[PDB]
From a paper:
Recognition of N-linked glycan at residue N276 (glycan276) at the periphery of the CD4-binding site (CD4bs) on the HIV-envelope trimer is a formidable challenge for many CD4bs-directed antibodies. The glycan at residue N276 (glycan276), in particular, has been found to restrict antibody access to the CD4bs, an important site of vulnerability targeted by many broadly neutralizing antibodies isolated from chronically HIV-infected patients. Cryo-electron microscopy (cryo-EM) structures of these two antibodies and 179NC75, a previously identified glycan276-dependent CD4bs antibody, in complex with HIV-envelope trimer reveal substantially different modes of glycan276 recognition. Despite these differences, binding of glycan276-dependent antibodies maintains a glycan276 conformation similar to that observed in the absence of glycan276-binding antibodies.
The most potent VRC40-lineage antibody VRC40.01 neutralized 81% of viruses on the 208-pseudovirus panel with a geometric mean IC50 of 0.073 μg/mL. We also determined a cryo-EM structure of BG505 DS-SOSIP in complex with VRC40.01 Fab at 3.7 Å. Modeling of the VRC40.01 Fab in the cryo-EM density was facilitated by a 2.83-Å crystal structure of VRC40.01 Fab. The two cryo-EM structures revealed nearly identical interactions between the antibody and Env. VRC40.01 bound an epitope overlapping the CD4bs and used both heavy and light chains to interact with glycan276. Overall, VRC40.01 binding was dominated by its heavy chain, with CDR H2 making the largest contribution and both heavy and light chains making extensive interactions with glycan276. The role of this FR-H3 insertion in binding was confirmed by mutating VRC40.01 Fab to remove this insertion; when compared with the wild-type VRC40.01 Fab, the deletion mutant showed reduced binding to BG505 SOSIP.664. Also, the germline revertant of VRC40.01 did not bind BG505 Env trimer, whereas the mature antibody bound the trimer at an apparent KD of 60.2 ± 5.1 nM. These characteristics indicated that VRC40.01 belonged to the VH-gene restricted category, unique in the known glycan276-dependent antibodies. Instead, VRC40.01 circumvents the obstruction of glycan276 by approaching Env with a different angle to have favorable interactions with the glycan without displacing its orientation, thereby depending on glycan276 for binding and neutralization.
Author numbering:
A (entry chain E): 1 to 52, 52A, 53 to 71, 71A, 71B, 71C, 71D, 71E, ...
B (entry chain I): 512 to 664
C (entry chain F): 1 to 214
D (entry chain C): 84 to 137, 150 to 185, 187 to 309, 312 to 321, 321A, 322 to 398, 411 to 505
E (entry chain G): 84 to 137, 150 to 185, 187 to 309, 312 to 321, 321A, 322 to 347
F (entry chain G): 454 to 505
G (entry chain D): 589 to 664
């Protein structure tokens, strides 16, 4: 059994210093190099550095020198247990990523094949503060535009942090629903261009309510719609 | 389980058998009287191991160590007491003290063939401190008689 | 630093077909390529830890291979959860580097997008801002784009685009595109359009309005 | 006694008695602190400012309220501290001691010297120590010449991080040992053919002052410095250091494939006690940054290096989180003159196609200081009973 | 090993090893507390009021002054206590802890559990334990079938008053035994033929809070009770309990 | 259980849940063990004699 | 050790001859090479297979010998 446990998700403001911890268990913790790998969303992975859990020394990707520190905590008693802490100093909004703790393959302490991984800690960096969405109807796109499918939606807009939750008719409508994955805009706030598609027999006569909620603010809103011009 | 000759391969298992048949198993009690200390020296352990601080619970091990010194010392006293009777090499001795049948009237058959050792104990425990006195003196003069013989030759 | 190229950008396969994903290094690296499967919301999973050395606990349909400059992850009988991202990773020189990754996509027949547009909501206009929204729905393959036009002259940098996960029912995808303006910038113009580009279409389907109508 | 004609397998990595020695030193250390004064009244809010009469921003001058012997009376009093001893708890800045959120501290009693005496470890009756005699023995394998001895050499319990000093020297050549070498998580121990000699000093003329905390309890404030203040530092002869590394490199080439570019670098990253060479000199604890020593590269072909130091009054040995101790400021000026015996190296993976041989001063637990000296010893149990056939019979 | 043909007098009342168990458990208990924090600074004047979010009057909510780690600094702080932990020292009512006139107290360390592990008692060399094997043995008389053994059962050191639980139970019948029965000042020990199974609960969603008393010393305050406050209680089946008394009466 | 004397008449058996020192919780589990010291020496008569 | 060396009927002595015959399945080696070639440390590594057999045979060989002597004294 080998097991790595990280800290939960975090929000940080620009210029702050962010700490991610990683508890390590089930094997002789001094005898494998731990590595840190960063998953920037949509992009490929990026490698931060590795730490010699015995000697305590660190080795870093040149790009991160001075701006990054890695540390190790251990006891000579209970060698099956230990910890690594990553401190990324002076964060930017473009440091927004998942930070993964990882460990090398057995007998392979000179390279980067990682066998065991922590659950990954999201670190999102913005100047924003807790705010529920505005709800704007994408009121059904009319027969003078849409043809045989009534496309409609709700532009659930300008909120932070995630998550919002969205449904149509409080979940009684699911056919053709697409809660498009949210974009963290240039404003530092999320937006979610949600839609539902239904037959143009039923443009607004059959019920369409977007049901909206935002657990960080605990804000809750709803909105009915009918066809545009 | 229950009967003569069967359980003799275990410690004390003979104890209800009659004295004649029990006389074969004497090595088993003799060995287990001291070497049972394996159940002490295999497992007595101190600080860091199983314990950290609580220091009177390391020094609680004086109970276990005190039992060990009593065990080796009570055993060693038998080897002294068996030795001065001129008998230390052996599990059995014939000796030149005659049986004074005042100590028990019971004949040679019924003591070996009927009684258990726990029953015989309860008779001779009246007289045993006479008998140990006689055994000591019987050897003490025998050592001298032998030294005179090795000299007069 | 060592640059890794993968190809293709995405590989499209039916359940039970066989896969071949290429990786290549900007200079010699001696058999020292790992391959990671990435499934969304989960840690990457190690398939191969040097060329052909399969990880313990990995099913034998995966097999790596390669030289000192180019490499190939191979899969026999692609399964319903093999549709994911795959990254090759290099570590012969520090720092460790990774390719751009390859998506594995469940093959299905060509399907053109259905297409729709919305002007900004009346409440949004009254709030002083204007999002013009365009929906492209349940197309296949994944390759789709919006071109945004204002006064129906083509424009750039004024929009964001979001795309669904692959539809498990029918392999399709949908794209939601959003041009956005201040209400003044929206009302400084009079015409709007979203033009749709897709792998299969006869011509770029364009949905349009004059400002205040759909 | 030299055991005629013998040959048997030693192993210093799996050797139990290093663990006994490690565990014993901790226990003897604790009892040497046990009777001394617990400093809890000093965990109090300090007003502070920098020292005046001086580069060094390192000395804080601090004033606070302290108890007298009389429970109802307390006194305004002041002392100096190093910047590493204090945290800004907060106009002027305002402070606490570093330990004061996590433990009390014991002040070490002035009468007890720290200085490491020779210690001998002895075999209990019915056991024998063996010693390997072969001068070319690495840490493992069949030693081809052995002696028994009833008790060891006079091993001295020095404590040090990045390099080891006043310890025993191999006679033949520079020796290097590891549990595998190739696996980077293992240390490489290095032991020298000849010592290389270090001078260290703390040139500030210290005046100690006594504060009476309570009825029979005293605390030893840093009272004043007389004359100018100047940095604690250490020196080594550059020529003899350069010679010594020339010899260690010529050994490492045997394992690392001859024509490979071996090079040294400083102890990259983490906190002060992994980044620095740290040792006690006569009652002061030094922390010195060895990058002046470990900065060189080696293709297959009269003056002193100086390295500066920082000092702490509180220390926390063997990373035991609850066990602060406070070392009193020792009077006057001090210096140490010591033999560097050997050093601890850690390897890094292939830096490029060319080299796999960047080395850095290592560390870990203090335990492998004992493994440096206990490298040639082993402990065995006599089994005196034996049975063998010949042609004699007993008769009845 | 069964000691064939053996038969000898056991007496469980005059037995020495019960007194060694009693003395061991007390010593092992004390040393489990000895490394832990002495709670002395909590023996201080309390302002109090009844709890709000509830029948019960059993919980009091109390506020007091406590030292920080810094000797010269102290804080207002508050916690919940039971009406049995506090005494009115006395406008609002004013209190102290119950013990605070007669002794200090040690806080039990949270890492140490009170759960009872099995313990075996073993004979030192040149002694033997004997075990009476007879399933109708009443604790006093000549046992007609015995074994030796080197070491006992895994005895578990539970502690309880009026009735005793998770211990071992005889297979033949309900056993009842006493040093004399007829003399009222002697207990009767009753051992059942079968268990009867008890469920017990504390239905409050309890919240711990940590207070630093000093430099590295902390006290675990009762912080808050979320949801409804509700009584701790135990259940047992009326049917099998009534049946079990029906057997002890016989 | 603990007992009481004749409660008015007929019954001598109002039983009540008892207690005391915790010691008899151990007497519940230790109800069947005993400890003994071995006496390994014995002396007994038979018809055999040693010679000098 | 002194107990174990005692019950084989051997307590007073550094050397004993005893009435157990050497089963050469315990080692096939001839009487010269065992005394003249090997060290005691080499011999241990063979007989450590069979030592618990040989101790059992020594014990029983003595345990009956005590009784045969008691009868030889009893036939007076
Ligand atoms: C002393 O210390 C050393 C260093 O730690 C240690 O050596 C290491 O031994 C391990 C043993 O596992 C070597 O690990 C790899 O083993 C697999 C075997 O795969 C099969 O079996 C496993 C069983 O678990 C299955 O998982 C798997 O599916 C297979 O069925 C090999 O495939 C690996 O191959 C690499 O090493 C070969 C050399 O041994 C190379 O020829 C090959 O290219 C592979 O990559 C190496 O070469 C690259 C190019 O030069 C280089 O850049 C890479 O970094 C890599 O070195 C592999 O053998 C492991 O290789 C050993 N470590 C090193 C650094 O080589 C000793 O075991 C240890 N000894 C003691 C007594 O403690
Ligand atoms: C329980 O112990 C008793 C003695 O206390 C054993 O009882 C009987 O003991 C006598 C000797 O006193 C035995 O007699 C001999 O038996 C053999 C074989 O039968 C015979 O060859 C001899 O001539 C002599 O008669 C007897 O065997 C023994 N048993 C019986 C059944 O009488 C008894 O053996 C012990 N219990 C058990 C279950 O073994
Ligand atoms: C550290 O801080 C302390 C406390 O502020 C300083 O100690 C105080 O220093 C002043 C002068 O700077 C002393 O006052 C002078 O004393 C002489 C005594 O002969 C007298 O002639 C002068 O008229 C004047 O009074 C003061 O006595 C001294 N002590 C206290 C308790 O205030 C100290 O200077 C700072 N620096 C160092 C290196 O300690
Ligand atoms: C040593 O002990 C003394 C006495 O406890 C401390 O001196 C006192 O410190 C306080 C807090 O800084 C001073 O209070 C201030 O007083 C002014 C004027 O009343 C007020 O405007 C401020 O808001 C503040 O309350 C107080 O004046 C001062 N002196 C006395 C006699 O109380 C001292 O801080 C302790 N430490 C040291 C290093 O001396
Ligand atoms: C300390 O010196 C001894 C020799 O006095 C070194 O022993 C060497 O140990 C290695 C394994 O660690 C041996 O390698 C193995 O050899 C067998 C040959 O049958 C082969 O089948 C295996 O694949 C493996 O190669 C090696 O033969 C042995 N001897 C020598 C001269 O190297 C010991 O390793 C040295 N310690 C260190 C830390 O280097
Ligand atoms: C460690 O190495 C350094 C550098 O070799 C040694 O520094 C030298 O120490 C002497 C004695 O203090 C200095 O002489 C004095 O210099 C001052 C300022 O120039 C002058 O006012 C005095 O009259 C006297 O000449 C010498 O300048 C200094 N050398 C250099 C180049 O800095 C240090 O002594 C060595 N010792 C130890 C114990 O580490
Ligand atoms: C190991 O050796 C390296 C190289 O000698 C050390 O790196 C140097 O670290 C110092 C820290 O004081 C850096 O100094 C600073 O420079 C920047 C401007 O570039 C300034 O903003 C800082 O305030 C500070 O003054 C220095 O740049 C850096 N590199 C060099 C060439 O010196 C490293 O500190 C050594 N580590 C240890 C623990 O010895
Ligand atoms: C490594 O070994 C050196 C050399 O022995 C240690 O340095 C010092 O050695 C000298 C001579 O043994 C000590 O001198 C003595 O000092 C006392 C107290 O002042 C005095 O009464 C004696 O007459 C004699 O002069 C000296 O104290 C000691 N230096 C210090 C400050 O400890 C060194 O301690 C050893 N350990 C290390 C880690 O270097
Ligand atoms: C011991 O550790 C220090 C870092 O803690 C090592 O790095 C040295 O740090 C200083 C201060 O940051 C560097 O100072 C230089 O100052 C000039 C001022 O004009 C500036 O132009 C430079 O960019 C730099 O900041 C110093 O350069 C740096 N050392 C090196 C080798 O560059 C220090 O080296 C360590 N001690 C020893 C003896 O190596
Ligand atoms: C650590 O090793 C590096 C090389 O890996 C050393 O590099 C350079 O060495 C020189 C002489 O030690 C340093 O001093 C300056 O050199 C220039 C040469 O033009 C001279 O004009 C200056 O007056 C001064 O003597 C130089 O700063 C240094 N440069 C760099 C980039 O490090 C380095 O000195 C070594 N450091 C130590 C503390 O061993
Ligand atoms: C036990 O007694 C304590 C202390 O008297 C009570 O704690 C205090 O309760 C009040 C409300 O009755 C809290 O004030 C409220 O705080 C929130 C913070 O978000 C604020 O939104 C409200 O407007 C209001 O100010 C107060 O924070 C709390 N703590 C203290 C130190 O006063 C407690 O209610 C009593 N009962 C229990 C079950 O603890
Ligand atoms: C926590 O510590 C604070 C500060 O020591 C305590 O607050 C103070 O308590 C006293 C005694 O009840 C109050 O004294 C009264 O003041 C009024 C007005 O001056 C006067 O009419 C009364 O005769 C009596 O002297 C005092 O006002 C109060 N506040 C302050 C700022 O001192 C507090 O009692 C402690 N305990 C708790 C649970 O907070
Ligand atoms: C536990 O069970 C044993 C039997 O296993 C009971 O033994 C009995 O003990 C009583 C005294 O407690 C004996 O009574 C005495 O009998 C003689 C007969 O000669 C008489 O003269 C005395 O006046 C007295 O009545 C009784 O004989 C004995 N045996 C039997 C079979 O009852 C023991 O009493 C039981 N203990 C409890 C508390 O149940
Ligand atoms: C011990 O015995 C008591 C009585 O049999 C058990 O209490 C009963 O527990 C159930 C389940 O929690 C209660 O049902 C729930 O009641 C609430 C309020 O009416 C309702 O909102 C829920 O939907 C559900 O019906 C039941 O009311 C309660 N009965 C009584 C009379 O209190 C208890 O659970 C037993 N077990 C334990 C471990 O104590
Ligand atoms: C030295 O003192 C000045 C004035 O009190 C202060 O601003 C400065 O921060 C101090 N130096 C350091 C290294 O903090
Ligand atoms: C002294 O250092 C220089 C530079 O690293 C090197 O050329 C020289 O060979 C060294 N001395 C010796 C004896 O190797
Ligand atoms: C409940 O609160 C009232 C008013 O504070 C008080 O008089 C009463 O005694 C409290 N009840 C109990 C049982 O403490
Ligand atoms: C159950 O209780 C009732 C009243 O005490 C009693 O009549 C009945 O006999 C009991 N059950 C049994 C099986 O005795």
């Amino acid at each position: 059994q080998v097991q790595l446990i990280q800290s939960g998700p975090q929000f940080k403001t620009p210029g702050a210093s962010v700490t991610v911890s990683c508890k390590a268990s089930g094997y002789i913790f001094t005898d494998y190099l731990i590595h840190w790998v960063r998953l920037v969303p949509g992009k490929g992975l990026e490698w931060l550095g590795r730490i010699n859990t015995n000697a305590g020394l660190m080795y870093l990707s040149h790009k991160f020198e001075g701006r990054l520190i890695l540390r190790r905590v251990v006891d000579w008693r209970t060698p099956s247990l230990g910890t690594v802490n990553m401190e990324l100093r002076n964060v930017r909004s473009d440091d927004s990523a998942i930070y993964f703790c990882g460990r090398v393959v057995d007998g392979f302490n000179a390279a980067g094949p990682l066998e065991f991984w922590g659950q990954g800690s999201p670190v999102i960096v913005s100047s924003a503060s807790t705010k529920g969405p505005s709800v704007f109807p994408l009121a059904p796109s009319s027969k003078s535009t849409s043809g045989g499918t009534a496309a409609l939606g709700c532009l659930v807009k300008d909120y932070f942090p995630e998550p919002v939750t969205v449904s149509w008719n409080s979940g009684a409508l699911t056919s053709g629903v697409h809660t498009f994955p949210a974009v963290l805009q240039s404003s530092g706030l999320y937006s979610l261009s949600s839609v539902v598609t239904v037959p143009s027999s039923s443009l607004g006569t059959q019920t369409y309510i977007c049901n909206v909620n935002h657990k960080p603010s605990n804000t809750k809103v709803d909105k009915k719609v009918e066809p545009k011009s | 389980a229950v009967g003569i000759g069967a359980v003799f391969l275990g410690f004390l298992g003979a104890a209800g058998s009659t004295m004649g048949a029990a006389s074969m198993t004497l090595t088993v009690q003799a060995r287990n009287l001291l070497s049972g200390i394996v159940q002490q020296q295999s497992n007595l352990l101190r600080a860091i191991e199983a314990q950290q601080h609580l220091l009177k619970l390391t020094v609680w091990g004086i109970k276990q160590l005190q039992a060990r010194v009593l065990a080796v010392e009570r055993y060693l006293r038998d080897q002294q007491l068996l030795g001065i009777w001129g008998c230390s090499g052996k599990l059995i001795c014939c000796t030149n003290v005659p049986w004074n049948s005042s100590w028990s009237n019971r004949n040679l058959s019924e003591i070996w063939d009927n009684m258990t050792w726990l029953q015989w104990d309860k008779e001779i425990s009246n007289y045993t401190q006479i008998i140990y006195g006689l055994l000591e003196e019987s050897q003490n003069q025998q050592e001298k008689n032998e030294q005179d013989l090795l000299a007069l030759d | 630093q060592v640059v890794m190229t993968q190809s293709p950008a995405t590989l499209s396969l039916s359940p039970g077909e066989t896969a071949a994903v290429s990786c290549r290094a900007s200079q010699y690296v001696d058999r020292s390529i790992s391959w990671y499967q990435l499934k969304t919301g989960r840690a990457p999973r190690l398939l191969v830890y040097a060329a052909s050395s399969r990880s313990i606990g990995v099913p034998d349909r995966f097999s790596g291979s390669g030289s000192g400059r180019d490499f190939t992850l191979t899969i026999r009988g692609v399964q319903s959860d093999d549709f994911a991202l795959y990254y090759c990773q290099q570590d012969y020189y520090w720092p460790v580097t990774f390719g751009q990754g390859t998506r594995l996509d469940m093959k299905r027949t060509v399907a053109a997008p259905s297409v729709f547009i919305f002007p900004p909501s009346d409440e949004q206009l009254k709030s002083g801002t204007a999002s013009v929204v365009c929906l492209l729905n349940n197309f296949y393959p994944r390759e789709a784009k919006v071109q945004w036009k204002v006064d129906n002259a083509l424009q750039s940098g004024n929009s964001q685009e979001s795309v669904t996960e692959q539809d498990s029912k029918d392999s399709t995808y949908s794209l939601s595109s959003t041009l956005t303006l201040s209400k003044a910038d929206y009302e400084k113009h009079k015409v709007y359009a979203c033009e749709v580009t897709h792998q299969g279409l006869s011509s770029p389907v364009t949905k349009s309005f004059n400002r205040g109508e759909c | 006694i030299h055991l005629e004609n013998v040959t048997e397998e030693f192993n210093m990595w799996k050797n139990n008695m290093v663990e006994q020695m490690h565990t014993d030193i901790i226990s003897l250390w604790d009892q040497s602190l046990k009777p001394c004064v617990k400093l809890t009244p000093l965990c109090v809010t300090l007003q502070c400012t920098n020292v005046t009469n001086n580069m060094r921003g390192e000395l804080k001058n601090c004033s606070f309220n302290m108890t007298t012997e009389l429970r109802d009376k307390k006194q305004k009093v002041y002392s100096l501290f190093y910047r590493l001893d204090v945290v800004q708890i907060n106009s002027n800045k305002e402070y606490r001691l570093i330990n004061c959120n996590t433990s009390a501290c014991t002040q070490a009693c002035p009468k007890v010297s720290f200085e490491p005496i020779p210690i001998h470890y002895c075999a209990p009756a019915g056991f024998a120590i063996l010693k390997c005699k072969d001068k070319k023995f690495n840490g493992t394998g069949p030693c081809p010449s052995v002696s028994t001895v009833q008790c060891t050499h006079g091993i001295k319990p020095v404590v040090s991080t990045q390099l080891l000093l006043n310890g025993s020297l191999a006679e033949e050549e520079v020796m290097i040992r590891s549990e595998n070498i190739t696996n980077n998580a293992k240390n490489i121990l290095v032991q020298f053919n000849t010592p290389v000699q270090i001078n260290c000093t703390r040139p500030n003329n210290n005046t100690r002052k006594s504060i009476r905390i309570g009825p029979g309890q005293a605390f030893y404030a840093t009272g004043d410095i007389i004359g100018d203040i100047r940095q604690a530092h250490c020196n080594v002869s550059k020529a003899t250091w350069n010679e010594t590394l020339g010899k260690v490199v010529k050994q490492l080439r045997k394992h690392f494939g001859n024509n490979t570019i071996i090079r040294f670098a400083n102890s990259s990253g983490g906190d002060l006690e992994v980044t620095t060479h740290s040792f006690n000199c006569g009652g002061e604890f030094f922390y010195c940054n060895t990058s002046g020593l470990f900065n060189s590269t080696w293709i297959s072909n009269n003056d002193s290096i100086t390295l500066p130091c920082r000092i702490k009054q509180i220390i926390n040995m063997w990373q035991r989180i609850g066990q602060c101790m406070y070392a009193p400021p020792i009077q006057g000026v001090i210096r140490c003159v010591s033999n560097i015996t050997g050093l601890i190296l850690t390897r890094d993976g292939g830096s490029t196609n060319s080299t796999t041989e960047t080395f850095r001063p290592g560390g870990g637990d203090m335990r492998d200081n004992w493994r440096s000296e206990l490298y040639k010893y082993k402990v065995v149990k006599i089994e005196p009973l034996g049975v063998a056939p010949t042609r004699c019979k007993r008769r009845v």
